[PDB]
Amino acid sequence: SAAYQRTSLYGDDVVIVAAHRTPLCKSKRGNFKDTYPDDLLAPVLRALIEKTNLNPSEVGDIVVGTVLAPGSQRASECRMAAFYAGFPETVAVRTVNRQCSSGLQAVADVAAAIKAGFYDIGIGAGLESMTTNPMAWEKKFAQAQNCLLPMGVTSENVAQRFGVSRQEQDQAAVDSHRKAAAATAAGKFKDEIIPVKTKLVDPKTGDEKPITVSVDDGIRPTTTLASLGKLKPVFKKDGTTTAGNSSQVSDGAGAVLLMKRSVAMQKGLPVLGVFRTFAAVGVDPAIMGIGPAVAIPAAVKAAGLELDDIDLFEINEAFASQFVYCRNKLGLDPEKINVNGGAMAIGHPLGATGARCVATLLHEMKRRGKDCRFGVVSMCIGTGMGAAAVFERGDG
């Protein structure tokens, strides 16, 4: 049960024509340590346009989920991004009004706006970068664990309160890396990922190496049950959460190009996905961090569907405790979730999570064929909320 719900029903009207992401790199010294935020979001926004041959002025709204950026810095980094991607003055750029969020509502509110007829083309996107461009348009560490410290004590509570332990939590982490490695090795991310040609300063000598990033650098294929249960608990004393069974903050961007179905047809644009429904729920405050498990059946029901109808699931793996609960509580087939790895392996790009997961889902749906008809993207909007989105495989 939910204290309240927001339900958006999109019908068959709202289609996705492009969904892309940068690779994700670990924020601490990872491969984006010398790339500024707009240099992450800009190629993703540019990729949507290029894939669709669209005049950037036709885009009605860009909404970006972003957590790390303090105060006004949020919008100015996104405006930079949109400017360098070739969007004019007139294309409005908005951030999501949340202290802490994974940015799935950015896609949902773009879709809602199209549904209500406010404009015909929109972009829902997300960005996180620990770096700061000295060149401003016209603290970040604090904001990060500000979202993660409350998130970590709740999922550890849910673990003690529901009986989730190191065991399943670690197993989930092993699986995540196994699946992320297998995906990477098999080239399954090639389609969704937009390579980022940046620079990397070498700590030993300080020279700038030209670099193209193509791979998520947080995947650790040598992870097993063995080495994980060697790191000490990260929060509590006898806490089951580790640096191994929780995701660390990653730099990256994602973006989703949404439009009304009739405008995609006349533009000769293949439909990647159909945005069916979105539910956002307020959960029981005495059991926080269980958001996804209330939001999933709420969104699936609004799609006029059953849990078993859903072929794929993208559920955020910020914490294995949290992730295992939701899977087990809903009795989901673990073969259908994060089939190509999750946050624990490829990184947790906070506000870029929502757009990241949409790209991963839809492209895997694209690859799996017509029988992979229904997908779910689910995550929190802070500890006290759950958000889930239902997507149908688009027809190409």
Next chain:
Amino acid sequence: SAAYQRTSLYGDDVVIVAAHRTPLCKSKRGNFKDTYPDDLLAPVLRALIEKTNLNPSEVGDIVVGTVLAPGSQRASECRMAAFYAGFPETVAVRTVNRQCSSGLQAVADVAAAIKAGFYDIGIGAGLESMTTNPMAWEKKFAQAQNCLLPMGVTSENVAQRFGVSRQEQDQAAVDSHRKAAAATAAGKFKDEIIPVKTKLVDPKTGDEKPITVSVDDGIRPTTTLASLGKLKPVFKKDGTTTAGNSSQVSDGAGAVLLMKRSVAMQKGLPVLGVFRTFAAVGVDPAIMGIGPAVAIPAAVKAAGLELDDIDLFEINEAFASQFVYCRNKLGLDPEKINVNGGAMAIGHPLGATGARCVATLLHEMKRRGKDCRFGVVSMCIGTGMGAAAVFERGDG
């Protein structure tokens, strides 16, 4: 029309037994310049308890709207507050997950939680203070106009785009101060206001004067149409917004004690108000800052009511441009709105606005008699949202 809506329907189940506020003082050198945040929220939380003879451990949840507090500082100031008001370890204290908000959803989500049966007693509250306690539990300027700068360019847009001007904007400001002065002089705030016995350092000598604050110090009774149209535009060149027809950031707290109706009956507690309905709407992004005008009829309809059924309105006067539009667009009788003044006179306590306005409404409803049956509290949740709450006069 709304891009989306969240509707909470409470029936007759959720009752308000106490609603109080501190006076509001202008943040720049005003009478709370030497009072720390918890010293504002603590007497308000204590007042609820004392008015109802309630064991603080019986309170199931405290949710606080607060904008000024950076990152983790939000929660720790509220936890301080609750500790000093005599709440135990076990009473959870939460902040509202918004970068920018007036805190009306805090009351709504407490009500929703009671409706869904999660607990029987809750407090929805709000706090803003420009001061910072050196004694932490166990930047602020930036966050303020971070909420206000976008809010000010939108309402000025709505003014140019809809034809609202200096004229009506200033008239609204004159009226606000006239009504706030009349209210103060007549003692109409005595019931809702909890006096704050603090200290005030004198700038000339630096001594601490014992002080009890009882009056809102931002009321300027000598305001007329004359002196207002002498201050230069604050944002744009030929912009109609002034320091006079917009509200300035005020220090203060408010709190609302909510419970299930049956638990108030058995406790022998007079009902101040009945929380009927709450609507939160996402508005057309091309016309932002018009939130209240979409939320009001949405919440009123969900109450199974008509606009004319509503006896009183508390609509936030952060900007007169914004405020006049909403009144005129909905064709509301200006005699029924902010009858005791608004934000432009008594100050804009950002996240304490929601709880502030509930107290003002319900006590004026209490004073006006049985015929004052329906009230509306409405405000934004950032530029792109509107929130409205429907209340029925409680029976005492």
